[PDB]
Amino acid sequence: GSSGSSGTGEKPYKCNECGKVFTQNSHLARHRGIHTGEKPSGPSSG
């Protein structure tokens, strides 16, 4: 058998990088910024 946890915070504005939840798009998009910023050293991407 298994146990499935059930938390409270399911919204269409939930981030994927970390897994945060918001109410307004802006609040979310702006948050995602924390993830999208610094660049990976080396030509890995470029």
State the residues that interact with Zn ion by CB under 5 A: 15, 17-18, 20
Residues 30, 4: Cα–Cα separation, whole Å: 31
Q: Name the residue nearer to Zn ion (CB basis): 4 or 33.
A: 33
CB of 2 to Zn ion, least distance (A): 27
CB of 42 to Zn ion, least distance (A): 24
Q: Name the residue nearer to Zn ion (CB basis): 33 or 40.
A: 33
Say how many residues make up the chain: 46
